[PDB]
Design a protein around this ligand. Structure first.
Ligand SMILES: NC(=O)c1ccc[n+]([C@@H]2O[C@H](COP(=O)([O-])OP(=O)(O)OC[C@H]3O[C@@H](n4cnc5c(N)ncnc54)[C@H](O)[C@@H]3O)[C@@H](O)[C@H]2O)c1
Ligand SMILES: NC(=O)c1ccc[n+]([C@@H]2O[C@H](COP(=O)([O-])OP(=O)(O)OC[C@H]3O[C@@H](n4cnc5c(N)ncnc54)[C@H](O)[C@@H]3O)[C@@H](O)[C@H]2O)c1
Ligand SMILES: Nc1ncnc2[nH]cnc12
Ligand SMILES: Nc1ncnc2[nH]cnc12
Lengths: 427, 427
């Protein structure tokens, strides 16, 4: 068995939910319709490290339908949906993923992606957060020569690529999928607008209405989180280091504050910074009894979880814990500080993941075919492909596009078929 | 008298409202505090073409406080606030602007900006919409040699610059002020979110709640217009040619439709496209009795106003007209299709105009000092200045910034003092 999952008998349930998800993921299904016969990824050998959800199962089966061979792992110890992993394993696709991995198991799973039976090695990487990219660069430099490139899903992974490139550590081309407009402005924003609430509601019976909620970070994720909680009746506070993002939050009516000032005043804290130790021991010591602390950024290091190691952790249910302080005060920590929407719920819904994952497939096609055209730098896909991703999703939600006339296209200086915006337009 | 205004005796009223506006415009006042003694614009001779409002009066007096000499005109026949123009004229600043200009008067006013007494000619242009840039390039090529550059306020003006540059027609450097983040994502969005309603409410006693409103265009302006009307209880429809913007609108719950389909169904139509004849004769013929038609894009050519020339126009009050069709059906047209927020109300409020106009002052300083470093292309100001503009506005609205620690700045790859985002970050 060239796989490792929790329970293979969950595969039928996984197939049933994959069938539903396909009907919500028109971008991926359109790529199958366009490319499954020509098989543009025939000869592609993709090592993948990305949350092993039902939506990712549709991504994997799209890559395979286009001719790729893949080996898969999750990029978080809690984000796997076991029945999705089983459905993939039952297809004979190598997948190494279960919910509740230890850290040792996590890195073992990544490692299994880099070598398969009969001398299988990847020539492509598909990464979400930079861990797979790190393992290959730091532990398997011999593999790098054969890797055509990496496509990277998320803001933190791209930040890690930028720092590698600045220091001459990046040894392959990288496609930044996060900053396709149809990824960053949809998945990060509208996805979290729904899936933060999902994680909070599944974890506890805390009401949102009337609570004071603090969001740390007002980028794409924090913007979606703030809209989510404000719509449900919370008073929303925002912390920011960036004066432009702070000004955006203020102009939406949120008070912009520091956690150093407001720790005792908040009912719910959500870290969405992509940064390091933005919630410290002293912050948590000051929090009210039964305050809820969670992280929706990529890494649990947004919170100094280590500082709680000597306190009693009383489990409430899976991925919901009380941390009991010496004076008896308790805080509720979700998923041990790991990604709350994937650890306490199921991540983003299928429709917006289709937009993200359509970009991933297009990036893998571009790297597999044309990686010779790229240097060891970070690139984004062209705007015409970004627009194509959007076009493929309009039919499902019933949006009807207006067509420019010749004179209207000339008036604003565009081709009738796009691209319709200048390169650095911000949407 | 080196000026032309409607009534100089309105100057005292203008001064009173300028004094209030200063307290809402901390960016401009901060630039006065930083630069009025060093006078970095001493020797600058600025021809300006930008809506002659109270807020623009604060911009003009900031330029003058920094040492500039200016000659001013409005960029729209209806956008001048006469008491603001009088306050400027009473200071001895040449201004040629009144509400209700004819087209001949409009272009005469622009022309007055290009030559003053004693051989005064500009060495800088400050433009909003591209009309001043057009006049100089097409009618006064001898002036071009002495023009160090132009700073351009709005999306349509930048579109015109791009097309000039593509065809080799741009003969001076241009700073695109519209696409400072602290302009496009604030003025265009939050400004119109307030000032569209202002124009509609001052013009008619039409209720927004329960109406079906169609917004043509879902860029920065259309996004703000949609939020405005949705918050007041309208059913909001959106038309788009851009599939990414269409998908954004759909994900906010707006049905994305074509005016060709829905003309008979709408109560209010707002053009926000920057394009040509997006509302045609047949659209207007199909509109319901007493439907309200207005334009918030830069030019009245969004609507084919010419097609209504043979119908009786019955005036309701200034800038509010009935167009009476042969079957007796009437539509309400606002400001003859000119910018509705400035024609039927007073434009954006002071606070957000401060952010836009702080960018304008910084652009004029950069052109006056460093235009030799630029070619005849379109440029944007650097991100550190964009962040500075935001910083200068945080105090007024009580936003408190968090400061990165050394390790947090290193973790995300930024300097503690910024810039905090990659060059092409979209906010
Ligand atoms: N949970 C999900 O489904 C999901 C989806 C996309 C991205 N992410 C992750 O979420 C994180 C945020 O992503 P993003 O796209 O919003 O990034 P972003 O860069 O757009 O936003 C992060 C924001 O945090 C702010 N910030 C940084 N340090 C801070 C501090 N100490 N205090 C306060 N604010 C601070 C920055 O100024 C920035 O505006 C990343 O780790 C990303 O990988 C999660
Ligand atoms: N009234 C104000 O205070 C104010 C402020 C800023 C800008 N403006 C003006 O408003 C206009 C829009 O500015 P913006 O920043 O939103 O520009 P933008 O480019 O961001 O948005 C315009 C949108 O219109 C869409 N569009 C173009 N042709 C269309 C058509 N035929 N049908 C439907 N949609 C169409 C485009 O796809 C685009 O998304 C410009 O003329 C700009 O100069 C006015
Ligand atoms: N449902 C989902 N599947 C995969 N990755 C995700 N990231 C966020 N939500 C996700
Ligand atoms: N109040 C205002 N002053 C000047 N230009 C504007 N454009 C939009 N609103 C404005």
């Amino acid at each position: 068995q060239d796989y490792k999952v929790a329970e293979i008998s969950l595969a039928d349930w996984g197939r049933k939910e994959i069938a539903i998800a396909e009907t919500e993921m028109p971008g991926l299904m359109a790529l199958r319709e366009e490319f499954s016969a020509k098989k543009p990824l025939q000869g592609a050998r993709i090592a993948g490290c990305l949350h092993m959800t039902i939506q990712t199962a549709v991504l994997i089966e799209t890559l395979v339908a286009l001719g790729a061979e893949v080996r898969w792992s999750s990029c978080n110890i809690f984000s796997t949906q076991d029945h999705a992993a089983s459905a993939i394993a039952a297809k004979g696709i190598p997948v190494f993923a279960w919910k509740g991995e230890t850290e040792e198991e996590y890195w073992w799973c990544v490692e299994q992606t880099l070598s398969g039976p009969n001398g299988w090695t990847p020539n492509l990487l598909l990464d979400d957060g930079g861990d797979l990219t790190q393992v290959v660069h730091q532990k398997h430099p011999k593999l790098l020569t054969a890797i055509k490139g990496v496509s990277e899903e998320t803001t933190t992974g791209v930040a890690r690529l930028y720092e590698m490139a600045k220091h001459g550590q990046l040894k392959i081309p990288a496609i930044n999928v996060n900053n396709a407009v149809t990824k960053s402005k949809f998945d990060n924003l509208y996805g979290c607008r729904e899936s933060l609430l999902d994680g909070l509601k599944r974890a506890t019976d805390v009401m949102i209405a009337g609570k004071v909620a603090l969001i740390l970070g007002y980028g794409d994720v924090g913007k979606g989180c703030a809209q989510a909680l404000r719509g449900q009746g919370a008073t929303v506070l925002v912390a920011e280091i960036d004066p432009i993002c702070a000004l955006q939050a203020a102009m939406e009516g949120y008070r912009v504050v520091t956690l150093d000032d407001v720790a005792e005043q908040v009912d719910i804290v959500v870290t969405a910074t992509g940064n390091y130790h933005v919630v410290t021991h002293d912050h948590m010591k000051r929090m009210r009894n039964q305050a809820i602390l969670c992280n929706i950024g990529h890494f649990d290091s947004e919170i100094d979880i280590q500082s709680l190691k000597q306190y009693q952790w009383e489990n409430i249910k899976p991925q919901v814990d009380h941390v009991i302080f010496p004076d008896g005060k308790r805080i509720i920590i979700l998923a041990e500080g790991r990604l709350v929407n994937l650890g306490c719920a199921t991540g983003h819904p299928s429709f917006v993941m289709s937009a993200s994952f359509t970009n991933q497939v297009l990036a893998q096609i571009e790297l597999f075919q044309n990686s010779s055209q790229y240097q060891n730098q970070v690139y984004v896909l062209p705007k015409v492909l970004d627009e194509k991703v959007a076009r493929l999703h309009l039919g499902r939600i019933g949006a009807k596009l207006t067509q420019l006339s010749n004179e209207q296209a000339d008036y604003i200086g565009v081709d009738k078929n796009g691209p319709y915006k200048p390169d650095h337009y911000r949407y």
